Amino acid sequence: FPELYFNVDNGYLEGLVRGLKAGVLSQADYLNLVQCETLEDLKLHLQSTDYGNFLANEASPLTVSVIDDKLKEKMVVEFRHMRNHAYEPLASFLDFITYSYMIDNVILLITGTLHQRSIAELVPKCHPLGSFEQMEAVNIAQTPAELYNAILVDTPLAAFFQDCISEQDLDEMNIEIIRNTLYKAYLESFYKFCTLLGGTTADAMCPILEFEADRRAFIITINSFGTELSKEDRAKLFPHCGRLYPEGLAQLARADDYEQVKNVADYYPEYKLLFEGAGSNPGDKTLEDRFFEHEVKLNKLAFLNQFHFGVFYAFVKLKEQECRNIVWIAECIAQRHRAKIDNYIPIF
Amino acid sequence: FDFGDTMVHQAIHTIEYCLGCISNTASYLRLWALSLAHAQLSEVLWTMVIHIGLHVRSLAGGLGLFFIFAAFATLTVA
Amino acid sequence: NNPEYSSFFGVMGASSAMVFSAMGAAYGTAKSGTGIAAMSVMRPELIMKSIIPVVMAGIIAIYGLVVAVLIANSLTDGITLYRSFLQLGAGLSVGLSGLAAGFAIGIVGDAGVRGTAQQPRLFVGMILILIFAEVLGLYGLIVALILSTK
Amino acid sequence: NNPEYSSFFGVMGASSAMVFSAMGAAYGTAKSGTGIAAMSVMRPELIMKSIIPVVMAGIIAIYGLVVAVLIANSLTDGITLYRSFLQLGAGLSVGLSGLAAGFAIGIVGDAGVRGTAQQPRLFVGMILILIFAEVLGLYGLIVALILSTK
Amino acid sequence: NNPEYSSFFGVMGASSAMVFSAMGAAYGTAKSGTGIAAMSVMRPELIMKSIIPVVMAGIIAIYGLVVAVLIANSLTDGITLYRSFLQLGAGLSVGLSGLAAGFAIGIVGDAGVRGTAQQPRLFVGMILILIFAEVLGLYGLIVALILSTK
Amino acid sequence: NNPEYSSFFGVMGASSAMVFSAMGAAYGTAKSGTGIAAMSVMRPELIMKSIIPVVMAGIIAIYGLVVAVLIANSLTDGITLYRSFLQLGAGLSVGLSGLAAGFAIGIVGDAGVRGTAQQPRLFVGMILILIFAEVLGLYGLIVALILSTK
Amino acid sequence: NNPEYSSFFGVMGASSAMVFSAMGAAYGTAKSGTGIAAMSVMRPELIMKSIIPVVMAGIIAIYGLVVAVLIANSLTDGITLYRSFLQLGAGLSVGLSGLAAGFAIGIVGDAGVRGTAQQPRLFVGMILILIFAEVLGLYGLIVALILSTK
Amino acid sequence: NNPEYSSFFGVMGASSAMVFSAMGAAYGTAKSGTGIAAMSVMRPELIMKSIIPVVMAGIIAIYGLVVAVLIANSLTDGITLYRSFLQLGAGLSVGLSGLAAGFAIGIVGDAGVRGTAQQPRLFVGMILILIFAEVLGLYGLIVALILSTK
Amino acid sequence: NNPEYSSFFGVMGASSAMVFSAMGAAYGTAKSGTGIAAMSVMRPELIMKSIIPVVMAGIIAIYGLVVAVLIANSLTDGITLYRSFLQLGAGLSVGLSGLAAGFAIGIVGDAGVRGTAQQPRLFVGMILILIFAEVLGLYGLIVALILSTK
Amino acid sequence: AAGFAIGIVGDAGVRGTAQQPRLFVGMILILIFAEVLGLYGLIVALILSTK
Amino acid sequence: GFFSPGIWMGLLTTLFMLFIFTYGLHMILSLKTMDRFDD
Amino acid sequence: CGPKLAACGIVLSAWGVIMLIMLGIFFNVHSAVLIEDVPFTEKDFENGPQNIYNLYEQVSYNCFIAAGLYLLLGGFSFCQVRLN
Amino acid sequence: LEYSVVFNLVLWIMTGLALAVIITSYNIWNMDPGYDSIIYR
Amino acid sequence: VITFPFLFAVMFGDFGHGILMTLFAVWMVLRESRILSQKNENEMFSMVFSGRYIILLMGLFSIYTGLIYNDCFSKSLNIFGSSWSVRPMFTIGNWTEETLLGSSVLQLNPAIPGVFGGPYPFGIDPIWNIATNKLTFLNSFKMKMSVI
Amino acid sequence: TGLELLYLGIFVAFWACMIVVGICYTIFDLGFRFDVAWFLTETSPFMWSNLGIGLAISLSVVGAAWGIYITGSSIIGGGVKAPRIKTKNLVSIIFCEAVAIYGIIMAIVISNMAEPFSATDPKAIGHRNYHAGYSMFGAGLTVGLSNLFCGVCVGIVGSGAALADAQNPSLFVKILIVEIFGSAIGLFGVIVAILQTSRVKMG
């Protein structure tokens, strides 16, 4: 099926994004980057790959914050080009990548308005992937109720609020409940969208989204114990896409401690190995580190087929991990904390 | 108590008994049904297997009939 | 005397009695097995009770076999055409009713197993619900017998 | 004398009565089974009330059977083409009216069950809604008897 | 005596006996092989056991072959039209019943491999469900042998 | 003598033998070469092992070709309808069974190579399951020889 | 002598030559022009290099025009079915080839224009791929000239 | 001598010439007018400059009109089938070619105008590309004028 | 004297002249009407300007009526097949060209009116585009008047 | 045709009227322009029914 | 009464070219345009 | 091998010998129930019943020889079930 | 005579009429009015 | 305790399968003192072992039904007499002409008096294992049985 | 979705109507009509032939055209970051055009065979002419559809090879072998179509 139609609209961008993927840093490149003794040495190594001149025309008293910002700037430009060149099926899919950032940007807008801050103060600080089309919400910035209706009118995200959150819920609930509530509706809506793109996009992007549901339910549970969240709150936040949903998800909702969470993980061999591989002891990889390491593994596996949209999601996530890695190497080096520097996640 | 729910459930049980006197009677046809299949499984599994060992000469037939019976036994069990 | 094509409707009866019944039983099996496989991950013990929909899918193919055999054993070149249309009606009436049964056995035999995994008390309910699926194949058989033996 | 093809439309009657009624009863059961199973976990006590839509989907298959039997018992080789078209009519009438009733019963017998565990007062309402579904099968039966007996 | 066109149906039977069985055994294989590959990365040791669905799909291809060969060896230049129809029916009745078993082994094989990987206790129960798929092909063979030899 | 149009079915036989086999081998080769290319970027060393599914897809094109040649060198204006239908049936049997074998070769030749990229132990398993695909082409061939040489 | 319907096929030939070539060239143009529109925002100077696929698509319309005019000039009332079917074949041949060639030109343009915009080295590569796409159009022209002069 | 019903193909020509050209013009106009409206909100000074795709779409409908009127004036009671088929082919040719030109005009008009909103230098390229679109209407018209006068 | 069925084609013309024009006008009115509804909330004053799309959709329905009535007034029992087929061509010519017109009107009126919501200066541009859409109905009408007055 | 037009413009019109009471005027005009298609169909149908 | 030679030949041709027209038109209805442009 | 295969070989040994010797008997007594099972040919509707009796003896030997092979599978399996 | 012409004319014209009505009907039935700015308020 | 085994045996009524299932259940009962100490991990064997006595009972009834049906593995007891009659009885001057047709093609026994061997004291007549119409006869029986 | 459903509806309705007709003419005993004999005889052999020739070209051209843009799109898209791709990986396009070559070869060979009968009675047309028209159709159909599938496969696999090169140049030489296994299918189509053609004569 997809092999016949897919190239007609996407063969160029499929070749382009795989071409950009080939530009990511090898394990050997990270092993060179960690030998550096200043940000200028990182610049000289990064100069040997696609990051060449990304830090040119910038202040000689260099800072790790600038490197982070320039890495994101490059990633944003790359993503914008692919989104600008796309046609409706891919374009809609690439918009589903953007929604993950858009949600966090809207969380800022709401947070600022709940503290009566002008949204014009917040917009320069937002993740530039999640940039708005319509701006009346940003321009008005008057009240949480005005923002809620303005978001609903202006934003691609608006449908997700209608699935889960009223104006009264926005006044009553904590913003972190709101953050996760939107993500529940988002993962389910994007998972349905991937299954509507039947064949290779479904069978390669669904594994990643299923892990994104499972990872959220695990992390939310192990973080919920020391909190006022009820069992009903945990349940109301868990995404239904994951292999947990038929039973283990409800068991995580009923559970409250690491041992019980591990007893859920112990039913599924991947998650069993992940928990066994992380006690979170001093110098250990943590449960969250193992999940990110696995998330990369799944994203690499999406590149093991030639024609499906899954590579665009995996690309953005992997480039985000490459930024996390280069910043972490730069932070270790700037702080002289070499002893833990190897904790970056290798990618390709 | 409720006469409504009581009468509805008791009427449904009565109706299920009266209609069951055809349908649940005919459920015993499952007997005949499986029996025919069971018989023909046995017949076809015999006729399409053991018969191959029935060659016209002692040496050729007796050597084949051993392995043929093992296939028959295997399928007859499973 | 009798038309040359007369046996065609008879044999298409016998085939249809099987084919649609097999399609029904196949779908019933496939759905149920998928559910069973998925549930067993957190339920190593329910497996042997959970197979029940699969067996109820199997009997649909057997109801097809009953009629398909009955028709086949009552075919001949000289068949009166009226007997052939009776046999066609039989083979469709079991065949497609078994298909319908297989759809109900499939959806029930998925959802009921999943629900039983979440709550063992559902088991009895699922039994009763599944009977009202499998009985379709039986009704298909009843009329198919009346027709074939008329 | 009567055309020898005439029994074809008569058996298409008996088959359609059964087949389409089974298709209705299947879809009514399948949706209801999904409903009951998905519901059971939160309110397991509700199963013995919540089976009832399945029984109604069973009744649709019975209405098909009653017609399919009555047609089959009335056939003959010599059958007048008039009666054969009546039987096709009766068969489609009940069969597709049963299919219609089964679509209603399925959609209601899902959603109403999933409502009922959230709010038990719905149960009497779901019964009343379902009466107005199951009756479609009865209207199909009424017409099918009126046709096939005249 | 017989129509020179008339061997067409028996030949379509011989073809159908293979072709639809092959479509089945292919789909069953294809689905199961995808499952085995997607399982193996985690559990390589399971391959030598989890292969079984593919073997059973192979059995369906054999059931096709049997009937196809039987029909073909039974053909003749002036074949009796009644015998040609019997062969058509045999051919569809195995061929499509093998398609139905191929669907069933496919879905169960793929899901049941993932299930086994996540809970090894499933494998012994999965075999039962796979036999309950594969036997549909055998029931199709039973009828097809009956029709060809009748 | 034989009727004028007689040879048309046998011509469609030779074409179906080749065309459907080409469709199969092409799809098999496409899915396989896709799987190879995607694997090879990560594991350049594995191509010389992983090529085998492409070779097996080519063998399906050979199975089409052989039957098509046999039909094409058997065809004549003088051909009896019986041998013309046999050539049609053969061509469809190998061509469509070959297509089925090509579908399975393509699915496993992908998923298996992708799995092998992650876990080399899969290779033996992948070959076994791939043999149970390619053999359907051989079963197609067997029936096609038996028909077309009758 | 010749049937009054005879000229109808050569007419449909002339139509198909022009229509299916116009369709192919339109699609080729539509894709390429959409690519130009997007490209020009970053590389406004590059338009008059990047327009190549657009004129090439127009040339595919001209290939159909040539054949269509040639057929149209070759038509008459008293035309033999032989000449009429030759002209039909020419029309279909160039026509579907004109779709195919125009479609490849469009897709290759939509890619190649954007590829050149980001990487000037690709420009000649695009043109080579487009020349091959045009040669497919030549093959449709060449057969069509041959049959139209036969 | 001429047969009855003979005007049908020729007037289907006349209608099709108009109709399919108007459909091409409609799609051309619809997509162009959409892109113009969206562009014009940012750039009102480009309104009158940007109408040209809509003018070209009107010209496509006029090419259909020209052929349609020329056929409509040449149709007569008891006309020869030769002229009737020439008029069919002419009207199909311009009409269906006018669809193609319409899609190219609509797509290039929409993309071109919205790209021009961001970059004025696109306007020159867009117009040249739209000439390479619009000329397909002339090519259809040429063949249609030729055919309708043979 | 003249044949039976004489009027049937001209009757389909009269209906077609109406129905397809009404479908066009309905789409035109519907799509543009929704844009007016949306715009009115932002721009209280522009409602009575923004109706012109819907007025022109009414004009398309009037063009259909003009031809439909002219055909209907021209029908008789004894009508020559010539005028009956011409009237079919007429009714399709206006009806489907009016469909094309109304489809264009709907889109350009929606996009134009939503554009005027953001920037009222677009109204002059929208009217020019609307004239180029509406005239497709006039072209269909011209041909249809010829094909009904002849 | 008139039915679809009325349904679409009636829906969008009534919805928009929730925010804009002035839309009622435009809505009635558009409803007239939709409904008259039914009247035109009746006109020709009366003509044909009496020809 | 129900069909004729010229009709059959006409139809095989017509249906064949209508299949090609469907294929061509399917690709044409599959044409798409951008909703954004570069900086 | 393993003990599972040896246990199967014991069961098939006993069952095989039982059925195969009973077949050897039913063939040697020329039993009429076996007419559809014996591989007769057109030349067996000529000369007389001696022709079929020769085939019944040969097929009786097939089942006796196969039973002998199942006795050997028995002796092997009774070793393997203790050795594994 | 030519009942086969008449039959095909009636069939293919009734088919082409019906398909043009059906496709247009399906389009206007399933068209999107896009009034989301009101669904949000 | 009887009813379930009885219906199972009506279903599973092959004489040889009745024996093989009987044997399996017997080997579980005979090895009971051993099996009670063995691995719990073979849950399949533990389940059927917990059914061993009931499985045996239904195995015995399946022998009994298989005996009345007169079939082991498509084989029947030629130890018995017959209601069928030898070929000479089809050739009593009457029916000999039909037996000459029967010396080229298939024929049906009419069960006419004097030719027919009369009422029968065993289970099903052994001849119905080989007869081409047997399934019709068997179906008339097994339906009517199940109903009662 | 919708545009496929409209076509699917026509497709299912077509076969449903054939089943209705097939039953109808059977049960009404009219099944002496629609004897495939007159259809396969009153049709002109030239119709079958010319469709054959045009199929041989055009289906090959379709297979090749898909072939071309499927690989080409990837050449371009990888080429942005790996310009080296274009010169060498273009061999896939050459093989896609080779599928078109196989078309034009077989089509020209077929095109030599046809000549006028000067006859309209099926008996005066005679077996050779019918057998030729059918065989030519068969050949042209065989090569056409075989090439159709061959070219699409070559385009697919060649795209894969181009995107492999984009990561490592050495992969191209290794992977390229699959384009042969693709291309061979088109050659097999040619071989069969030659043999189907090999006995033909007309007039």
From Swiss-Prot, chain B:
Subunit of the V0 complex of vacuolar(H+)-ATPase (V-ATPase), a multisubunit enzyme composed of a peripheral complex (V1) that hydrolyzes ATP and a membrane integral complex (V0) that translocates protons. V-ATPase is responsible for the acidification of various organelles, such as lysosomes, endosomes, the trans-Golgi network, and secretory granules, including synaptic vesicles. In certain cell types, can be exported to the plasma membrane, where it is involved in the acidification of the extracellular environment. Required for assembly and activity of the vacuolar ATPase. It comes from the Eukaryota. It is found in: Cytoplasmic vesicle, Clathrin-coated vesicle membrane; Cytoplasmic vesicle, Secretory vesicle, Synaptic vesicle membrane; Melanosome. Residues 40-60 are vacuolar. It comes from Rattus norvegicus (Rat). The chain crosses the membrane at residues 15-39. Belongs to the V-ATPase 116 kDa subunit family. This is V-type proton ATPase 116 kDa subunit a 1. The gene is Atp6v0a1.
From Swiss-Prot, chains C, D, E, F, G, H, I:
Disulfide bonds: none annotated. It is found in: Cytoplasmic vesicle, Clathrin-coated vesicle membrane; Cytoplasmic vesicle, Secretory vesicle, Synaptic vesicle membrane. Proton-conducting pore forming subunit of the V0 complex of vacuolar(H+)-ATPase (V-ATPase), a multisubunit enzyme composed of a peripheral complex (V1) that hydrolyzes ATP and a membrane integral complex (V0) that translocates protons. V-ATPase is responsible for acidifying and maintaining the pH of intracellular compartments and in some cell types, is targeted to the plasma membrane, where it is responsible for acidifying the extracellular environment. The record marks 134 as: Essential for proton translocation. Its main location: membrane. This is V-type proton ATPase 16 kDa proteolipid subunit c. V-ATPase is a heteromultimeric enzyme made up of two complexes: the ATP-hydrolytic V1 complex and the proton translocation V0 complex. The V1 complex consists of three catalytic AB heterodimers that form a heterohexamer, three peripheral stalks each consisting of EG heterodimers, one central rotor including subunits D and F, and the regulatory subunits C and H. The proton translocation complex V0 consists of the proton transport subunit a, a ring of proteolipid subunits c9c'', rotary subunit d, subunits e and f, and the accessory subunits ATP6AP1/Ac45 and ATP6AP2/PRR.
Swiss-Prot record, chain K:
Expressed in brain (at protein level). Residues 22-39 are cytoplasmic. It is found in: Endoplasmic reticulum membrane; Endoplasmic reticulum-Golgi intermediate compartment membrane; Cytoplasmic vesicle, Secretory vesicle, Synaptic vesicle membrane; Cytoplasmic vesicle, Clathrin-coated vesicle membrane. The chain crosses the membrane at residues 1-21. N-glycosylated. Accessory subunit of the proton-transporting vacuolar (V)-ATPase protein pump, which is required for luminal acidification of secretory vesicles. Guides the V-type ATPase into specialized subcellular compartments, such as neuroendocrine regulated secretory vesicles or the ruffled border of the osteoclast, thereby regulating its activity. Involved in membrane trafficking and Ca(2+)-dependent membrane fusion. May play a role in the assembly of the V-type ATPase complex. Belongs to the vacuolar ATPase subunit S1 family. Accessory component of the multisubunit proton-transporting vacuolar (V)-ATPase protein pump. Interacts (via N-terminus) with ATP6AP2 (via N-terminus). Interacts with RNASEK. Interacts with TMEM106B (via C-terminus). This is V-type proton ATPase subunit S1. The lineage of its organism: Eukaryota, Metazoa, Chordata, Craniata, Vertebrata. The gene is Atp6ap1. The chain holds residues 413 to 451 of 463 of the full protein.
Curated annotation (Swiss-Prot), chain M:
This is Renin receptor cytoplasmic fragment. The gene is Atp6ap2. Residues 24-41 are cytoplasmic. Disulfide bonds: none annotated. The chain crosses the membrane at residues 3-23.
